[PDB]
Amino acid sequence: STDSIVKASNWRLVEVGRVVLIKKGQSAGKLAAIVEIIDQKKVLIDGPKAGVPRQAINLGQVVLTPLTFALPRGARTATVSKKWAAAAVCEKWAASSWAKKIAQRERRAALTDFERFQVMVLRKQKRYTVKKALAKA
Amino acid sequence: GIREKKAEYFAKLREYLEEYKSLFVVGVDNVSSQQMHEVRKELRGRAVVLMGKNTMVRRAIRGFLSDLPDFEKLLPFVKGNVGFVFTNEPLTEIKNVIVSNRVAAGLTVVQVYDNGQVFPSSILDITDEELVSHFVSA
């Protein structure tokens, strides 16, 4: 065609109001939101929902999300958790299959011996079914 | 010396803005110095014309906001290559001497200013039959 086809990779961008996971430290596995940028490697986050304070942090232990919301720069914690829940964002991270596997390995860790035998036999029967099913198919 | 020169230009602009009751902001885009001098030679009657850096023009008027407060809305129209044709002579006649005579199309009248009022020059170029349609239809 006459249509020029550019392909730019799509990266999770640092920006105001950006929803973020903390992966290390005391607030490991939590969520916060970036408000303002300090530098390339430093930012300000806040997790009043998740219980993470308002603090400066490092992008190496921080890991970004594909999610984001909108926000006025300089906002304080009231407005923070406000627009957060207004956006209803924990719900969306819950919808994130990422987080589904998070809680998956969580539960899988929290399993019990007898639960594992249960899983064993359940998967056995399921397997027989799927075996003969796909054998037909 | 350069600041004295810019202030000298400001002195001309103030002298003119105060002494003359009207000024025609004229778009001077692509006007040649020879066309300008012919405009001067024809405007020797009344009108005097002043050019310069529009930034200095706007700085001049912004400084002159203390008295003569109503030059403030000249500044949205101090843009592009424009200059002032200050005068006391009648509107349509100065407008015709500016636009028609010694033009090449090409100096235009970007804006005209008279006694704290704003004219797009269209109502000025309105020749006749407007008062007729107004008085007859009413």
Binding site: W11, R12, L13, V14, I37, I38, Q40, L44, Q55 | -
Partner: protein, 172 residues
């Protein structure tokens, strides 16, 4: 020369029958303990007045903290230091939330770049910057630009194990 803090050290000459209650003198100090704070206080006051610690006394030490410490902020910084061949003044600027970590990075940068060390280094002054566009340093004004935002390309994924059976990525 470790995690930093800040203290106000105040001291005076030892009183006398001639001068009971001599003048007190203050300094804001950055240091990792009141000990060093007092130390460098004696240092600066030695290089200013004709006093030694056994000539004076510390009225007080007061550990200081920031007003609004969840506020990312700019500072201008005036520093003196000592090169191999001489000594020089300097003015730098910082973007950080606290004077403490600001000075932290200040020193670590004067180590990496100029290899002037804490002993070689003297703070003249620190001041948080009120106004934007009064920053003079572009590596800061970059970050000052409005509605700023960016990526962090080439993600690196820390391995806790040796082998990964799959070619990793940086899709981030």
């Amino acid at each position: 020369m470790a995690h930093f803090k800040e203290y106000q050290v105040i001291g005076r000459r030892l009183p006398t029958e001639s001068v009971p209650e001599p003048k007190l003198f203050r300094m804001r100090i950055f240091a990792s303990n009141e000990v060093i704070a007092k130390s460098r206080y004696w240092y600066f006051l030695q290089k200013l007045h004709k006093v030694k610690k056994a000539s004076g006394e510390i009225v007080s030490i007061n550990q200081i903290n920031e007003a609004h410490p969840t506020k990312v902020k700019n500072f201008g910084v005036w520093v003196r230091y000592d090169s191999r061949s001489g000594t020089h003044n300097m003015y730098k600027e910082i973007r950080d939330v606290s004077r403490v970590a600001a000075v932290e990075t200040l020193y670590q940068d004067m180590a990496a770049r100029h290899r002037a060390r804490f002993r070689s280094i003297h703070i003249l002054k620190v001041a948080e910057i009120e106004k934007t566009a009064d920053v003079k340093r572009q590596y800061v004004k970059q970050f000052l630009t409005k509605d700023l935002k960016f990526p962090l390309p080439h993600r690196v994924q820390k391995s806790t194990k040796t082998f990964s059976y799959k070619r990793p990525s940086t899709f981030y």
